[PDB]
Amino acid sequence: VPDYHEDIHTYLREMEVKCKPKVGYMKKQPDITNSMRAILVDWLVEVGEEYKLQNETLHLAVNYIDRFLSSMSVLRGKLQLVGTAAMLLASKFEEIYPPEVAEFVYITDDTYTKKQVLRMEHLVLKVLTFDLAAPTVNQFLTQYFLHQQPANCKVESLAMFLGELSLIDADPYLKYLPSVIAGAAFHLALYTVTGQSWPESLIRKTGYTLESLKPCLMDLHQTYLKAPQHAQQSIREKYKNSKYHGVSLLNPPETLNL
Amino acid sequence: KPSACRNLFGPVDHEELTRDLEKHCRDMEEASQRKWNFDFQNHKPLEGKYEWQEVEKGSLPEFYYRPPR
Amino acid sequence: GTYGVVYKARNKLTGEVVALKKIRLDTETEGVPSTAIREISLLKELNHPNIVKLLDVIHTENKLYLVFEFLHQDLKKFMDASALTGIPLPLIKSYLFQLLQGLAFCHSHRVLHRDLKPQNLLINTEGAIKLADFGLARAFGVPVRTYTHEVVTLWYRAPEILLGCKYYSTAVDIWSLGCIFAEMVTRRALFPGDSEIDQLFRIFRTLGTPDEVVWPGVTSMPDYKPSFPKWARQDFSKVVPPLDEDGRSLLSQMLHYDPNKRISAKAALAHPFFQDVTKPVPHLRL
């Protein structure tokens, strides 16, 4: 039933521009940094794995985090609290069975209390004005996959892998829209696995070309290339699993054909 | 224990942490109480422009008093 | 009847009467209910004339207030009140048209209501009907993933859900709407099952037991059982006798077994049944 696919794609393209966190927001933070943020996000990849949560749930939580940090000053000791609160909210929103607060308190090695996680939950909701239905890189990828020539699960897993890596690094990824990061991930993954490129059917749909995706693609290819040396490794480990066809183990191409 | 079970940036001052959060959470009162002339804190109508009247549940659609699942 | 009170209030201008809804919150465990989280986040993204407006939210120390657009009555109560009267076709047609508008809007904004029933459709004195209660709604994706199983009030649950479909979609809302359409015509529920199996058997006796021809893949679904009695499909004119050729055409398209064949809300909006739709005020006092 592809009756609403186009309406939905258009709606998401409209909403992503709204639910977009301030690109240079980290400069405004008196204490936290992009490196502390990378540390937080990496731990959330682990938490998502521990409780077998959906990848969408992880993407949503990062969106909430960045939007909250885009307006609220947070000292390093409360950062994991914002992360835990955001994951709880994303689980409630996205999961059939979201982990209970006690499970989230536990997973922080009991750093904060249940009441604290709930007050933070109260704070994030207030700051985000309950606007939790945010578009994600994951939501766009899911739409682009429907254009494979033919369907390839290794391509899908590698694309999802690339999209997740984008979450870890505020610089440079905060500067691209979810739909753009998803375009770059789909092409890089497809190219890596099959040698094929961004389908023209997807140009008709998104209005994006390799030329418009290029800047994101250059960044992403470098991230893909340097991935084994990154301080954060929870995503690479996650994607070594046969569930994802061990795609993090694949070798990125040396150059692209742009 | 599992690997996901970790503290990231040290122990926290629980007393001050709870107090900082209590404060931050004390925002949702302001303009809404103003617009609807209702004191959501005390659940007491007030001012005027919105003629608040408590009606019996049988007079309006049940949706309006239906609790979450 | 019903113990309790609800704060109502009138102002002026266009949106003058509003109703207050309040939620008590667990402070040490759970916090804001996920149902409230889904309804509030989604509902605030659904501003349509046929969707009951969420006007404001107030999150206090231990309470959560929802300021809603106020509407006089709900369809279940209206039908109960007209149980021996009969709702005029022009009013039935207007309600269906409007419900399709509201539903189509939801779907094009990636939201499944998932619990469409007369009790969740509110009506006013002007002839308007709106979708209420998005506590069970969910933002979907393209393609849809696997979501909560056995959703939807039994009587309005699509056979996909009952047969354990791994993935369900917008079509589950159209099935519910088709059941309500048939119900407005007789004021009696189309498929009032007593259990999941009873619900399925009632559907099969009315629409016939689906085979691979009618619904490709039906016999491979998780909860399909080859022991299912094989009922013959009955003459659609028999399902809802008072309905005319156009009404029956639409209803049959809304109750198609195959979810990929079942008509969409936006496609239904162009059906000849609505060729003469208008906006009548209700036939009974609200």
Curated annotation (Swiss-Prot), chain A:
Record's comment on post-translational modification: Polyubiquitinated via 'Lys-11'-linked ubiquitin by the anaphase-promoting complex (APC/C), leading to its degradation by the proteasome. Deubiquitinated and stabilized by USP37 enables entry into S phase. Ubiquitinated during the G1 phase by the SCF(FBXO31) complex, leading to its proteasomal degradation.
Record-level GO BP terms: animal organ regeneration; cell cycle G1/S phase transition; cell division; cellular response to cocaine; cellular response to estradiol stimulus; cellular response to hypoxia; cellular response to insulin-like growth factor stimulus; cellular response to leptin stimulus
GO cellular component: cyclin A2-CDK1 complex; cyclin A2-CDK2 complex; cyclin-dependent protein kinase holoenzyme complex; cytoplasm; cytosol; female pronucleus; male pronucleus; microtubule organizing center
Subcellular localization: Nucleus; Cytoplasm
Molecular function GO terms recorded: cyclin-dependent protein serine/threonine kinase regulator activity; protein domain specific binding; protein kinase binding
Keywords for this protein: Acetylation, Cell cycle, Cell division, Cyclin, Cytoplasm, Host-virus interaction, Mitosis, Nucleus, Phosphoprotein, Ubl conjugation
Quaternary structure annotation from Swiss-Prot or TrEMBL: Interacts with the CDK1 and CDK2 protein kinases to form serine/threonine kinase holoenzyme complexes. Interacts with CDK1 (hyperphosphorylated form in G1 and underphosphorylated forms in S and G2). Interacts with CDK2; the interaction increases from G1 to G2. Interacts (associated with CDK2 but not with CDK1) with SCAPER; regulates the activity of CCNA2/CDK2 by transiently maintaining CCNA2 in the cytoplasm. Forms a ternary complex with CDK2 and CDKN1B; CDKN1B inhibits the kinase activity of CDK2 through conformational rearrangements. Interacts with INCA1.
Family: Belongs to the cyclin family. Cyclin AB subfamily.
Full protein name: Cyclin-A2
From Swiss-Prot, chain B:
GO CC terms: centrosome; ciliary basal body; cilium; Cul4A-RING E3 ubiquitin ligase complex; cytoplasm; cytosol; endosome; nucleoplasm
Localization in the cell: Nucleus; Cytoplasm; Endosome
UniProt GO molecular function: cyclin binding; cyclin-dependent protein kinase activating kinase regulator activity; cyclin-dependent protein serine/threonine kinase inhibitor activity; molecular adaptor activity; molecular function inhibitor activity; protein kinase binding; protein kinase inhibitor activity; protein phosphatase binding
Keywords assigned: Cell cycle, Cytoplasm, Endosome, Nucleus, Phosphoprotein, Protein kinase inhibitor, Tumor suppressor, Ubl conjugation
Domain of life of the source: Eukaryota
The protein's assembly and partners: Forms a ternary complex composed of CCNE1, CDK2 and CDKN1B. Interacts with COPS5, subunit of the COP9 signalosome complex; the interaction leads to CDKN1B degradation. Interacts with NUP50; the interaction leads to nuclear import and degradation of phosphorylated CDKN1B. Interacts with CCND1 and SNX6.
Note from the entry: Decreased levels of p27Kip1, mainly due to proteasomal degradation, are found in various epithelial tumors originating from lung, breast, colon, ovary, esophagus, thyroid and prostate.
Record-given protein name: Cyclin-dependent kinase inhibitor 1B
Species of provenance: Homo sapiens
Source taxonomy: Eukaryota, Metazoa, Chordata, Craniata, Vertebrata
UniProtKB/Swiss-Prot annotation, chain C:
Binding sites annotated in the UniProt record for Mg(2+): N120, D133
Residues that bear Phosphotyrosine: Y3, Y7
Entries under Pfam families matching the protein: Pkinase
Catalysed reactions listed for this entry: L-seryl-[protein] + ATP = O-phospho-L-seryl-[protein] + ADP + H(+); L-threonyl-[protein] + ATP = O-phospho-L-threonyl-[protein] + ADP + H(+)
In-chain residues carrying the UniProt-annotated modification Phosphothreonine: T2, T148
This protein's GO CC annotations: Cajal body; centrosome; chromosome, telomeric region; condensed chromosome; cyclin A1-CDK2 complex; cyclin A2-CDK2 complex; cyclin E1-CDK2 complex; cyclin E2-CDK2 complex
Induction data: Induced transiently by TGFB1 at an early phase of TGFB1-mediated apoptosis.
GO terms assigned for molecular function: ATP binding; cyclin binding; cyclin-dependent protein kinase activity; cyclin-dependent protein serine/threonine kinase activity; magnesium ion binding; protein domain specific binding; protein serine kinase activity; protein serine/threonine kinase activity
Localization per record: Cytoplasm, Cytoskeleton, Microtubule organizing center, Centrosome; Nucleus, Cajal body; Cytoplasm; Endosome
Presence of the UniProt keyword Metal-binding in the record: yes
Note accompanying the cofactor annotation: Binds 2 Mg(2+) ions.
Notes on activation and inhibition: Phosphorylation at Thr-2 or Tyr-3 inactivates the enzyme, while phosphorylation at Thr-148 activates it.
Enzyme class: transferase
PROSITE patterns: PROTEIN_KINASE_ATP (PS00107), PROTEIN_KINASE_DOM (PS50011), PROTEIN_KINASE_ST (PS00108)
Residue ranges annotated for the Protein kinase domain, each copy included: 1-274
Residues that bind ATP: 1-6, 21, 69-71, 74, 117-120, 133
Function: Serine/threonine-protein kinase involved in the control of the cell cycle; essential for meiosis, but dispensable for mitosis. Phosphorylates CABLES1, CTNNB1, CDK2AP2, ERCC6, NBN, USP37, p53/TP53, NPM1, CDK7, RB1, BRCA2, MYC, NPAT, EZH2. Triggers duplication of centrosomes and DNA.
Protein name: Cyclin-dependent kinase 2
Organism annotation: Homo sapiens (Human)
Underlying gene: CDK2
